[PDB]
Every structure is written in C-alpha cells, then in structure tokens.
Design a protein around this ligand. Structure first.
Ligand SMILES: Nc1ncnc2c1ncn2[C@@H]1O[C@H](COP(=O)(O)OP(=O)(O)NP(=O)(O)O)[C@@H](O)[C@H]1O
Ligand SMILES: [Mg+2]
Ligand SMILES: [Zn+2]
Lengths: 421, 151, 392
DNA sequence: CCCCCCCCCCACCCCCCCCCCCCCCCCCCCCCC
DNA sequence: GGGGGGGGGGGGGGGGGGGGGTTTGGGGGGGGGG
C-alpha cells in the first residue's frame, strides 16, 4: 500500500501547490511565510480542502490517524520545494486545521466519535508543564549493537520485542543523542457552563497538543478545539478505556483596533463613557463604578535600581447594606475584566485559594495546581460575601494580596508562585 | 563475564609478612614479651575478646625499622587507605600465631570444640584411606583499629 | 541563555545556561564508577567501570550496579574499597524565577545533576545560573511494560558549572588607614551619636532607638562565676508599636550592619520530613546566632510551643531538648532584637504592651529594653517621607 | 451555659517456577548353553 | 532350566524461557472562653 500512500501524499502536494482563490496561491504563500519566520507548520481550512477535492476530505475524515501524517509529509516536501534550491534540514511540519463543522458539545462525545475528527468547545481549566515526545528514535541492540530507527507519528509504537537480526530476549535501547523530540502539553477542557444539564456536575476532558499548539492557551480561556476524539489504555472497570482528544487546532493587537483604541483614547468624554459602561443596568453608585474602572485599568507596576518591585494592582472593598448591588457589580467585573476569577467567601478553602497539591492521573506523579489567586494573576479576583470567609483563609489571602506571592512547601515540593492580582 | 585487571603499588604477601613481623616483635619500648603476643595469651585464656590495635604502635614499629635501616612500606598509610582488607590480614596473622591457653577453661563445654573435634575424628577416619572449618567460626575475638594521636 | 520555562525540546543535547532558583536539593550520595578487586588466588587486581545515563554525555550500554565476585577462572574476588573510585552525586531542582513567569502560569522547573566538586555549591532558595548539557534519559514509555505511551521522556541538565547569583565581608580586612581612623575617631566624644546615627540614615528621629541598637551590637560581657556559675552578658531588645513605623526598616539596617546575624519573621526542635525515616535535631535562629544576633520581626505572631521555650534563651542563653531520648542542652548565647505589632487595631498608647499584644508580661519583661514606637502624624515628617516616596 | 474552636481519623536484574527433551536404567522376553 | 543380552518403556535430571517484584476536606467529639 506504499504506492497508495505515495498517491495520497502527491494528492496533498498538489493541493498545496494548486489551490488558489482570487489569483493568490494562499497555501504556497502561507507555507513560505511560515518558513521565513521559522515556524514549521501550516494552518489549513478544511472548507478549502472540501472545495478542492472532496475525495481527499473523505479520506481524511474516514481515518485521520493514518491520513494526517501523510498530509504533514506532503507539507514537508512542498516546503523544501519552495524554500531550497535542491541540486545546487527542516523538521516534520505540523498540520493545523481550521473548521466550521457543527460542534459536538463536550458531554455528547461518546463511543461513536472514536478516531473521528471532532470540533468542540469549553473552558481550559488546567495546562500541564511541557513534556518531550520522540519523533525520531535512534535505536541500538544491547548485545550485537545492530542499529535501527523508529520514525514516529504522534497520533496512535514501542521498541521492537527482539533483535531484528542468541541476541538476548528484549534487547533494544535508545541513543538519546541522535534521537529527535518535540514539545507535548496536556490540557483539561471543561464544558461550557451554560451548556451543563440541569442539576449536573460539569464534565471535562483531558487532551493533548504538540509543536506550535503548546503554550497557546492559559487556564480560564474559552476555546473551540478541533481534534481527534481518541482512546488510551490507562492503568486505572473492565475492558474500559480513557477518552481524550488529540488537538489539531485551537481558536480562543489587530492593525485597525490599534486605530479604534487611538480614536477612543482621543475622545474627551472617555471616563464618563466607561463609567456608564460598567454594570449599565445598575442605577447610581457613580463613584463606585468610577473606582471599578480604576481597579480594572490598574496603576503602573514599577521596578527600582535595587531590584525591588512595586504594586500596580488596586484592591477595592465594597462593604455595605443588603441589596445594594455589590454581588451584581462583582459578577459584572468577572465578565468585563480580561482575566478574572469569581469566588464566594464561604465557598473558599485556603488550598483552593492559593495553590494545592495534585497527583496527575496520566503520569501518576505529584504536581502543584493553582488556586483562585493564581488563576486571577494578571487580573481581578472577585471575592463575594467576603465577610463569611474563615480566618485561616483570610490569613492565606495576605501574602497573595500584598506580597503578591504564594510560598509553598507541600509534598516536599518547595515552590513560590506569583499573584499579581 | 570477563574482567580486565591492572597492576597496583601494593603486595598483600609482603604486607602480611610485615603485619605478622609487627605482631610477634613489637612492644611499647619507650615506656621502659611483645604487647600483642601477651594480649593474645589473654585472648587464649578466654579472659579478653576486644583485640585493639593502635596505629601509634604501628607508627612506632615503622620508625624503629626505619631507624634500623629497613623500609617498613608505611603500613599506617595502607591501613588508613584500605582498612577493611587489613582486618582480614591482621586476623589471619593472629590465627596463625596465637599461643595456647594457660588458664584452664573446661574446654569441652564449648559446642564448637565438641563439633570440630568430632569433624576432626571423622576426617581421621577418612584419612586412613578406608581447611577443617572456615576460620571466622573458630575466631572468638573481635579486632579493631584505634586511630593515630596528634603528632 | 535560558530559564526552565523557555528551555524547550528543541534544545536537547545542546549546551545551555539556565537562570533560576534552587529547590529540592537531594542528599549527597556516593556513586560507584570504578570497582577494584583483589583476586584471592590469582593475585591480580581485577576491576570494572560503570556507566549510566548521567555519568556520560553520550549514550553507552548501562552497567548495572553489580560487583563481580568471580574470576574467569572461577577464583573468588575481594572488593577493594579506597582503591575503588566513587564520585559524589547530587540532584537539585532549579525553579524558574517567579518574576519572569507570565500572567496566570506556574513556574516551570528542571533537575540539574551535579558530580564531585560542583556538589553543594548551592542550597535551597539560592538564585543561581547553571550551565550544562540538556538531556533526555530513560525509556519514555517506549518499553513494552507501559501501556500508556503519552508520558514524556524524563529530562535533565548535566551540570558543568554552578554560578550562585549572590549579587544582582563577615570579618573585614583592616588597613593602616582603618586602624588610624578608628582610633582617632574613638577619642572624639560624639561617637555614640555619630555611629548610632549612621545606622538607618533614612529614618526620621528615633535617636534613642539607634543608640540602644548600637549598645546591643556592642553588647555586654559574659560572667562565669566560681564553679562555672553562668550569668548572661548578652542584651535583648523589643520594639513594640504601630505598623508602618521605622521598626521593620530598622531590622533591615541592623541585619545588614551586624555580623553573624539571623533573619526571622526559633529555639531548637526534633524534626522529621517526607523522605526521612528518622528524626533529626534542628537549630533555631538563636542557636544559629550563638554569640551572634537574632532579628525577629512580627514577634507577636510566635506560637505557644515557641514562647514557652523562649524563657530558656532569655534566662539561661541555652535551649533544652526533651524527646526521643536526645535529652541534652544547646548553646544559644545570642543578643536578640525583636519587633511586634498590635493584635487588633492601631496601638493604644494608654494600654500596656501586655494588653495591646497577646505576649505575656512574664515574657515581655525578659528584654533588657522595651520600646514602644508610634506613627506620629507630624507634618514635617509626613512632608519629608511623602516626597521621598513620590521620588521613588 | 452555649457556642466556637481544634483536634482526630479516615481515604532491570535475579529467583522462583514450570515445561520440555534426552538419556539411562530396569524390566521382560528370547535365545543359548 | 537358568542366565545373558537385546529391546522398549518410564522416570529423572538438566537446561531454557518467563514473569514478578501525602495533602485536603469533612464530620463529630471534646474542651475552653464570653
Ligand atoms: N441600584 C440598583 N439598580 C438596579 N438593580 C439593583 C440596584 N440595587 C439592587 N438591585 C437589584 O437587587 C439585587 C441586588 O443583589 P446583590 O447584588 O446581591 O446585592 P448585594 O449588594 O450583594 N446585597 P447582599 O448579597 O445581601 O450583600 C439584584 O437582583 C439587582 O438587580
Ligand atoms: Mg451580595
Ligand atoms: Zn542484536
């Protein structure tokens, strides 16, 4: 079937080389421009792949785990053909997908979607540290030192069971100098809160991304994911499998919003406009709204010659009578502020506020996970009904609120976290 | 599993000979039989089990030999460098040279005497054409090196 | 030039410099690299060298930690310590500098491996720059035991040097210029003003406080009477008062002026941790400051088991241990300066320190000098400190 | 006397083992003396 | 008519291959302060 794979590869090569709209070869341009800035990926809109030849899209969507590596390979070959004079070295290019297929909500994904390309959305609630996955393994036999290699496509390999021509039962080892690796990151996606069924607890998926999709999102961001709904046999029922998504695309200043915000800065009535625009259904409380605008913007953070650093963040306490719209103002600020977290004082614990220990079900090893203050870093933590908070929690607020740090010594993990809040 | 090997600046035959020479010769003569052989008579009487070696005694012996114009190969450095092996050498020298008891012991009351006597009798029954033990079994004393003083 | 964040899989097997902070320093362990064996009858000294993924910059077949005990001819082998070679080995976890970590992200960290003379170049909390080779190791779940192959490969830096970043004198040298000017100054009368006022020159007023600080730094002489009966010469001071007063800044100036000075914000203890299957006797700041000084900010916050034992520091200049059979007493012969805040509200100058702060009078009375300072609302002071803060 | 606090309790090599194969011994049968 | 030798079965040994080996939250009990 290698001739058939070669014809798939040549079909994709022709798609890169031939696809054109309104006199522009958009994917030749995008691939060249991506090479110039030294990001080795290509973002493909599958509307265009469908429009070019739907047979290719049918092959892709029938079995993406086999077809995606061939498309990546085709991109590498075209990349060389449009950036190197051959007869006078680049890595395996990442494919990135844009799509407008109808979204499957995160709760409805089940066994009939296994290995299909899927489009969904949710809130990223955690983002693991980066990790190294192999693309090319250089391999050696422990006894005879017969060397071979594994070239890997990360869509789901293992070391060979015995020597490929006594030589021992299980003999192969990796040569870590010649082997090539890539960045891999794990994310947890929670379903959109306004899509949760009545009385249900919100459900979530573990999911993975690599190369130029790592570090592209932070916790709390609302995203649409394109990826392969897929399976792996975890260590922790019977004949059961853990579901996960292999991400193929993410969607979450522009050169004219630059102009819009210059024009809005130039408006003389700006402060009144923003003041009116805070919680517009709440009548009155004019000075409080003005102060909320100040808290949103913040002062200016500073560093002195000594290395000492000075707070830019403003803290505001609204203490007062019932039904004065305090909670309504906090629940508005959690909407408008670009980073924000909302908690209530009686819902809190010191751990869930500063940071907590976790044991990752995937590695099965410890890692530290951020609480509300960390998730609010760079923005506002809205602590509603703050007077109901326990004393130890209010103690735990002090470092994160004034020193703007959290110092940690838990499970042997000594650590200090930042809390610009 | 084959092993490589290297030559090294030591010889345990020469040092074993040096150790037994020290043991059968030395006394604390600056304070005026050998200290160690007398102490081993105390061991033979079962009156003592803690055999203490002073590195200062070894040093005094080395200085006496060097004063008498022969090199002692600095046994102090060797025992300070690879001490564990020289426990075995010192104990073998003692086992090769310890004198017989003087005080009566009621020798048969030790099980080791009866069992090794029975093994010897059985071995003589064999030896008429019809080691006896691992030495740590018979070795009753405990041997310890005591460090150098300030000097 | 990197940090544990921007250190990336593209950098594997390259030589890298990482800017960071040390955490989780392992215990030092001796790592076997060559074993030497006298052959009992053969006479030869056989040997074996050893390999793992950390001892070599390049991959070689691992040699699995076994001493050989038999010759090719079957003769038994006796292992030779001292002639055998062991290297010190230590792991340290360098954390990213939290100042560099961007909005909403935890700090990344990586494990540096250090051998022999780089071991214990740093301790936990040290800001450091390490240079070494960034490496992968292990099977990464490619070995057929692991059904889960989403786990990444382990990675490390094999260290080639460790630069502590102490900068962005504990005993000083003395030149003839210093000897002359010290003695020439000592004959002047106002030295007790000038030297004390040279402490904390940014601080408005508080002359008597600075004089008392200087007397503590130049504290009194010990009295061992007959039968060795001990009476304490060291001096102890406590600054009660409002927050936002000179107190904490004075503790900074004292800490950076004194020598053998310990920062705190105590006594001694018998302690245990996650990996220890054993209990160890630990030194508090006064033991660490034996014949030195302790600086205790927020002293009103100290817990009961500490305060109960502070009496031994204050009376006997020592601390006694009374569990796990370690019944002993330790030298803790320091001169202490402490500072404290009201437990509720601004400080009520009518109430006693015993009443504005939860510390007992039977504890507060131990200190030789007991100051109460307050945020006076003087316009000249406020004008001065305000313009300093504005220029800042 | 009542309520709040805080304390407790709980969730890669080496050994054992088993399977497979080959040789040796012991019995039975037949022939020779 | 008994003993040796030939042939076949059954048991034991030896080798080879394989698999296994602490933090966070919650309720209830018990004790101390207003
Ligand atoms: N000034 C106002 N303008 C419009 N609606 C208001 C205003 N004040 C109160 N409300 C309404 O009354 C409610 C205020 O609720 P809420 O925000 O919880 O007040 P609150 O200050 O948090 N009181 P409490 O939760 O008891 O501390 C909402 O349903 C608002 O729509
Ligand atoms: Mg409210
Ligand atoms: Zn092989």
């Amino acid at each position: 079937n290698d001739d058939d794979n070669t014809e798939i590869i040549k079909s994709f090569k022709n798609f890169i080389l031939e696809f054109r709209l309104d006199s522009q070869f958009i994917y030749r341009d995008q691939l060249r421009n991506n090479i110039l800035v030294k990001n080795y990926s290509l973002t493909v809109n599958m509307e265009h792949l469908i429009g070019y030849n739907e047979d290719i899209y049918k092959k892709l969507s029938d079995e993406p785990s086999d077809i995606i590596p061939l498309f990546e390979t085709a991109i590498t070959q075209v990349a060389k053909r449009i950036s190197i004079l051959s007869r006078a070295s680049l890595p395996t290019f990442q494919l990135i997908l844009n799509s407008n297929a109808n979204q499957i909500p995160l709760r409805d994904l089940d066994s009939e979607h296994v290995s299909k390309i899927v489009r969904l959305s949710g809130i990223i609630i955690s983002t693991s540290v980066l990790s190294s996955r192999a693309t090319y393994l250089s391999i050696m036999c422990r006894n005879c030192r017969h060397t071979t290699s594994i070239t890997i496509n990360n869509f789901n390999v293992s070391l060979p069971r015995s020597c490929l021509s006594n030589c021992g039962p299980d003999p192969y080892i990796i040569i870590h100098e010649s082997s090539k690796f890539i960045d891999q990151q794990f994310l947890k996606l929670q379903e959109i809160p306004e899509l949760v069924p009545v009385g249900e607890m919100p459900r979530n998926l573990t999911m993975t991304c690599d190369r130029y999709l790592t570090n592209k999102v932070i916790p709390g961001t609302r995203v649409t994911i394109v990826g392969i709904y897929s399976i792996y046999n975890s260590k922790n029922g019977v004949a059961i499998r853990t579901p996960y998504i292999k991400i193929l695309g993410i969607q979450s200043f522009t050169e004219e919003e630059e102009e819009e915000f210059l024009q809005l800065s130039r408006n003389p009535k700006l402060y009144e406009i923003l003041t009116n625009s805070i919680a517009p259904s709440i009548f009155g409380n004019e000075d409080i709204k003005k102060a909320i605008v100040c808290l949103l913007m913040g002062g200016s953070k500073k560093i002195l010659p000594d290395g000492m650093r000075l707070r830019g963040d403003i803290n505001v306490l609204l203490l007062g009578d019932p039904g004065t719209a305090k909670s309504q103002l906090l629940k508005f600020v959690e909407k408008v502020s670009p980073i924000a977290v909302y908690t209530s004082g009686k819902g809190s614990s010191a751990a869930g506020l500063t940071a907590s220990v976790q044991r990752d079900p995937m590695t099965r090893e410890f890692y530290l996970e951020g609480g509300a203050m960390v998730l609010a870093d760079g923005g506002v933590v809205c602590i509603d009904e703050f007077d109901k908070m326990r004393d130890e929690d209010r103690v735990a607020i002090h470092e994160a609120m004034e020193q703007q740090t959290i110092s940690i010594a838990k499970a042997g993990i000594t650590t200090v976290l930042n809390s610009r809040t | 599993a084959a092993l490589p090997s290297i030559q090294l600046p030591v010889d345990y035959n020469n040092l074993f000979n040096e150790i037994t020479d020290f043991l059968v010769t030395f006394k604390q003569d600056t304070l005026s039989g050998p200290k160690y052989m007398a102490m081993l008579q105390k061991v033979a009487n079962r009156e003592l089990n803690s055999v203490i070696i002073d590195l200062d005694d070894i040093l005094q012996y080395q200085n006496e030999k060097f004063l008498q114009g022969t090199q002692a190969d600095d046994l102090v450095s060797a025992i300070q460098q690879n001490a564990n092996h020289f426990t075995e050498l010192f104990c073998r020298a003692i086992d090769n040279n310890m004198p017989l008891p003087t005080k009566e012991i009621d020798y048969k009351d030790d099980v080791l005497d009866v069992i090794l006597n029975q093994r010897r009798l059985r071995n003589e029954r064999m030896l008429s054409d019809r080691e006896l033990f691992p030495p740590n079994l018979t070795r009753r004393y405990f041997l310890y090196f005591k460090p150098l003083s300030q000097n | 030039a990197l940090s544990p964040r921007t250190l990336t899989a593209q950098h594997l097997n390259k030589l890298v410099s990482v800017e960071g902070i040390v955490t989780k320093t392992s215990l030092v362990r001796p790592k076997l690299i060559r074993s030497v064996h006298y052959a009992a009858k053969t006479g030869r000294f056989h040997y074996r060298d050893y390999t793992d993924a950390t001892t070599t910059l390049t991959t070689r077949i691992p040699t699995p930690a076994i001493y050989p005990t038999e010759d090719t001819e079957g003769n038994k082998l006796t292992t030779e310590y001292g002639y055998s070679t062991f290297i010190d080995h230590q792991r340290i976890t360098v954390q990213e500098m939290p100042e560099m970590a961007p909005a909403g992200q935890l700090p990344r960290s990586i494990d540096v491996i250090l051998d022999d003379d780089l071991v214990d170049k740093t301790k936990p909390g040290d800001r450091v720059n390490v240079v070494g080779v960034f490496k992968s190791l292990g099977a990464g779940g490619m070995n057929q035991s692991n059904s889960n192959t989403l786990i990444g490969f382990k990675t490390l830096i094999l260290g080639n040097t460790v630069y502590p970043l102490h900068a962005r004198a504990a005993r000083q040298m003395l030149t003839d210029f210093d000897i002359r000017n010290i003695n020439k100054l000592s004959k002047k009368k106002d030295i007790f003003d000038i030297l004390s006022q040279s402490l904390a020159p940014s601080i408005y007023g508080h002359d008597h406080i600075k004089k008392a600080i200087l007397l503590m730094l130049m504290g009194g002489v010990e009295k061992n009477l007959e039968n060795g009966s001990h009476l304490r010469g060291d001096i102890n001071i406590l600054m009660v008062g409002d927050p936002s007063t000179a107190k904490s800044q004075l503790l900074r100036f004292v800490l950076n002026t004194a020598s053998l000075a310990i920062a705190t914000t105590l006594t001694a203890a018998v302690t245990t941790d996650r990996e220890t299957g054993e209990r160890r006797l630990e030194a508090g700041a006064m033991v660490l400051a034996d014949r030195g000084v302790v600086c205790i900010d927020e002293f009103d916050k100290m817990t009961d088991v500490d305060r109960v034992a502070i009496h031994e520091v204050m009376e006997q200049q020592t601390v006694t241990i009374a569990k796990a059979g370690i019944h002993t007493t330790l030298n803790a012969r320091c001169s202490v300066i402490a500072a404290a805040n009201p437990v509720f509200g601004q400080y009520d100058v009518n109430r006693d320190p015993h009443q504005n702060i939860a510390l007992p009078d039977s504890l507060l009375s131990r200190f030789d000098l007991l100051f109460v300072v307050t945020d006076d609302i003087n316009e000249i002071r406020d004008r001065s400190i305000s313009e300093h803060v504005l220029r800042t």
